[PDB]
RNA sequence: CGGUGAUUGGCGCAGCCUGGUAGCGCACUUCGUUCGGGACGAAGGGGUCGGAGGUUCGAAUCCUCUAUCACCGACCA
RNA sequence: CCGCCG
RNA sequence: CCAGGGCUACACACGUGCUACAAUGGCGCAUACAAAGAGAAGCGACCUCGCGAGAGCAAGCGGACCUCAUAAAGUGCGUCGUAGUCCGGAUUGGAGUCUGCAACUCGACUCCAUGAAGUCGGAAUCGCUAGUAAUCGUGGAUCAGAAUGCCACGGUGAAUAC
RNA sequence: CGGCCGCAAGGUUAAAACUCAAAUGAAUUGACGGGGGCCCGCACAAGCGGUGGAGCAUGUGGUUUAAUUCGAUGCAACGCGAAGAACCUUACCUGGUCUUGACAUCCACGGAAGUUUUCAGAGAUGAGAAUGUGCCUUCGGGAACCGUGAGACAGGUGCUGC
RNA sequence: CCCGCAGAAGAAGCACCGGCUAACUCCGUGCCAGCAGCCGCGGUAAUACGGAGGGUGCAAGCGUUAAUCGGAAUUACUGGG
RNA sequence: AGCCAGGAUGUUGGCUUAGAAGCAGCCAUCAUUUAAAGAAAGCGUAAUAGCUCACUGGUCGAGUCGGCCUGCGCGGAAGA
């Protein structure tokens, strides 16, 4: 009857606990309030709000699965024995004590893989085949196919945007548009490079290849509000222009230097008779200028983030997927399935759940 | 420990640069029997 | 700054002056051919004409305004 | 006559 | 292990088939000529009922004898008059029969009504040289029921190979 | 590179770092050739009728699905495994149940096997209420079958046809 | 150097084990970690990785590295094309 | 207007049970004790404390407080 749920409260009720060292959780709590036995850290009140910020996270973390540890017993415990009265009562209450639980232990879920930079927003894959051939490419799309399944079975909305087919068969790239809502949050452990080991009809010689193939989830933001900035940041001087042909060139302050004070690039213009002119041309001049120095303060971070995963070594592997030994194997996380047909084509979240709960 | 990749200052992927590098090339093993698999002397002796 | 002449399918261009009906190649789709891919062949499909408003019964076309691009003139002290 | 690739 | 469900889903694409697009044809009446198989919780005459699928009754036969079982194309006679038409038999509505515990998902068949696309088929492409191709029906296996498939049988019967 | 020679083009002299574990020569057996000669099969040619367009029947890919079980996928997969999926088949799905088990062997205890129905449940199962109590005597027992417990183990249409 | 004293008493490692080249199996791991003088091993039944048992070699040493000649008739007078 | 007094309570007000006890904000903006005392106008606190002011008595002893319509004025007002 309701024995199906109770037995299912109490496996993702551990995973929780384990997942996060239950026990050692308390122990550095015990070692958070043993700072403050001493009276004497409100000297320091930037060290002082630090500690009791992270009190309150480590109380209400073990709290709610301390209540859970009472909580899967006496609910079991209201019906197990009173199932000795079989009484009606009894089903009403039950199940008051469970949706609170059950409340507590979902918030707990999506506390952990909430997490943090527009993490809930909508989505882009971007898989491609890289090399390897005609069999790089189909598994390229075998993984189009897998995404696919799995994230349109979970209510999200698939979109390909670019997309680039193979010669003969499967794609060489695709770049789809995965939107609903927390997409990024299930999506996020995926990027790494899928290996593949299996036979091809593609070889001549019927050989065990091992192909790989990437698939890169970003999520998605806004990119520039950008506007001009306060006009007192800007210095604006005129001087007379340096060239020839009259002493027009040399009796009139038509050129005009708009100098940024928070960069300090100069930008200039003489190339009118004006100076409204000259000084209307400068200032969108310049408004390109502090376009490419905040696309350089992007590209200079798109740089640094990634000569670090470049450097994670091997690249990520993620999931072996070896379909001819009919196995399948995560590599973080060590998660391991002998149904590769049905990995393929969707139900991935063997894979996904258990990723969200390391890290 | 490092990996000395290819592509020498990888801009923006940071997994994507590296499926071309020869870390990720494909491995395709040799048959036995199969189109392409002679001996000429074995594993052993 | 004015003045001149464009914006038509995924792309490159016709038709627009002369108001009623939008094509050409390439690319795409399906099929055929081949062991397979390209090439080749056979079928197709795709736009309401930069945005906004006028004139007329009716606007891709005719006026007017912007929006972007291209060319030209910006001279004499 | 045309006939490229694996 | 069990009950219901699914393997029968359907914007689609391909293969292999059957039915056609008619007049060397359709329909109606009459009438001639086969071979090969199967049959016992099976094949099921005659008779009676039902327009029919079938039912009731009740012989015979484990069979060269009894049943399935009237061969169909053919031929005689009449009509149709070259029209999407008396071609086509799709889809569908109603009423049913049988098997089976059960016929909604999802069976075959009969009756009445419905009357779709199709007027010989782009590039392409397949099979066959003789009782073959083509066409015409018959039987069997699997099987309670459920074939246009498969596997067998005989009817008519070519054209062409320089 | 340097020198010498040349109007020039360039000739002549002539390295090293580095890199590979071979490069090469003649000849043998195959295979291939848009090389040659000879020869055969519906291969072409000469014909006949198809397929490709239409509707349906069936199989497949894709898509859908809670599941649309799995295998076959150039020729040599696609009316193929299936000589027959309403239930069964059936391996799949959703839910309801069971653990020495649906099937096998051994041990210990019970009970002759079975036959008649009720009730609850979708059924599996969960109790009943009834009836029967034999073939061979060690007469702490047989054999046949059923129920129960204990562990060896059964069970697997799970994987690899590389 | 000799005599006497006690007590088997204080005294065995290092390399290798696919072929060359003497000496093989089990387990772990699965083109990974690693080996390597050359050819090459490792892709799930690895005598080649790593460990174990066994064996072979040398032995107060045993291996690696470097250098030299040898094999090399591979600068050949001996002794080549 | 000064000067002396009080300036109460459940009220840790839920709140996000990290805070707002009046004090960043949603409401509500009550009833109580009251002669009065905002379920708070500044200070002060991560939030409670602590210091005042509204409001209330004593004191004193006669005029006082904020707006309207206007007359003349001041600042704003730095050059070779």
Not at chain 1, 112 to 120: I, T
């Given at each position: 009857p309701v024995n199906n749920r109770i037995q299912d409260l109490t496996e993702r009720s551990d995973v929780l606990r384990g997942y996060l060292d239950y026990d050692a959780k308390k122990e550095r709590l015990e070692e958070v309030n043993a700072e403050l036995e001493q009276p004497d850290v409100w000297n320091e009140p930037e060290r002082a709000q630090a500690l009791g910020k992270e009190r309150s996270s480590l109380e209400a973390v073990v709290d709610t699965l301390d209540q859970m540890k009472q909580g899967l017993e006496d609910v079991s415990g209201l019906l197990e024995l009173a199932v000795e009265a079989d009484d009606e009562e009894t089903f009403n209450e039950a199940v008051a004590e469970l949706d609170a639980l059950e409340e507590k232990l979902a918030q707990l879920e999506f506390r952990?893989?909430?997490?943090?930079?527009?993490?809930?927003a909508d989505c882009y894959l971007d898989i491609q085949a890289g090399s390897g051939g005609t069999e790089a490419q189909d598994w390229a799309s075998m993984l189009e196919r897998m995404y696919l399944r799995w994230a349109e079975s979970r209510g999200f909305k698939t979109e390909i945007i670019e997309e680039s087919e193979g010669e003969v068969a499967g794609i060489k790239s695709v770049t789809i548009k995965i939107s609903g809502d927390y997409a990024y949050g299930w999506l996020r452990t995926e990027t790494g490079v899928h290996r593949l080991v299996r036979k091809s009809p593609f070889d001549s010689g019927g050989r065990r290849h091992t192909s790989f193939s990437s698939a890169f989830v970003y999520p998605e933001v806004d990119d520039d509000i950008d506007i001009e900035i306060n006009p007192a940041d800007l210095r604006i001087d005129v001087y007379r222009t340096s060239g020839a042909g009259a002493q027009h060139v040399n009796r009139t302050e038509s050129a005009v230097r708009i100098t940024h004070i928070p960069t300090g690039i100069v930008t200039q213009c003489?190339?009118?008779?004006?100076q409204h002119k000259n000084k209307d041309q400068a200032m969108k001049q310049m408004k390109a200028k502090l376009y490419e120095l905040e696309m350089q303060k992007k590209n200079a971070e798109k740089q640094a983030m990634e000569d670090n995963k470049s450097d994670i070594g091997w690249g990520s592997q993620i999931r072996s997927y070896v379909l001819d030994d009919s196995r399948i194997k995560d590599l973080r996380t060590g998660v391991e399935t002998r149904n590769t047909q049905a990995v393929l084509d969707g139900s991935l979240d063997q894979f996904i759940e258990a990723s969200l709960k390391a890290g | 420990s490092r990996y000395q990749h290819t592509?020498?200052?990888?801009?923006?992927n940071a997994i994507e640069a590296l499926l071309?590098?020869?870390?990720?090339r494909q491995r395709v093993e040799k048959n036995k029997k199969g189109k392409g698999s002679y001996m000429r002397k074995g594993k052993h002796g």
């Open positions: 952990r893989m909430f997490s943090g930079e527009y993490d809930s003489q190339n009118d008779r004006s | 592509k020498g200052q990888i801009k923006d071309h590098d020869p870390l990720f």
